């Protein structure tokens, strides 16, 4: 990420995610794991990356 | 460097400068049921 982060959204069916500040895979991973309540889609980040 | 086993050849990328820990981390994983530890043990003895 050159000078900033990826402030994007995710619309899974009806509801729409409003995540922000994505610089690495881990960041998006935490954003999904937190939003697990709203979005009924489990995420997983292994040691691989 | 390439890996052989269980029909899963994978050219592990070892850049110029990567420490032993990084090498161990990279070579870990892809090849099934294989592990890779790292260890740097070095002594020292000051002369006159």
User: CB distance from A47 to chain B under 8 Å?
Assistant: yes
DSSP H or E segment with residue A10: strand A10-12
Strand partners, A11: A16
Experimental method: cryo-EM
| Among B20, B21, A42, B24, CA closest to B12 | B24
The residue written with tokens 């899974």 in the block is A12
| Vertex A26: Cα angle to A41 and A10 (nearest 5) | 40
Nearest-angstrom CA–CA distance, B8 and B27? 13
Nominal resolution (angstroms)? 4.2
User: CB distance from A48 to chain B under 8 Å?
Assistant: yes
Nearest-angstrom CA–CA distance, A12 and B19? 41
| Among A44, A39, A41, CA closest to A16 | A39
Counting one residue from A and one from B, how many pairs have CB atoms under 8 Å apart?
A: 4
């Amino acid at each position: 990420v050159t000078g900033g982060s990826l402030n994007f959204d995710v619309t899974v069916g009806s509801n729409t995610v409003s995540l922000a500040g994505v610089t690495s895979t881990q960041d998006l991973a935490d954003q999904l794991n937190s939003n697990s309540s709203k979005l009924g889609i489990t995420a997983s980040i292994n040691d691989k990356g | 460097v390439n890996l052989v086993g269980g029909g899963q050849v994978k050219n592990i990328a070892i850049a110029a400068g990567d420490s032993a820990k990084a090498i161990a981390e990279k070579m870990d994983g892809a090849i099934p049921n294989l592990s890779a530890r790292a260890r740097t043990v070095f002594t020292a003895d000051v002369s006159g």
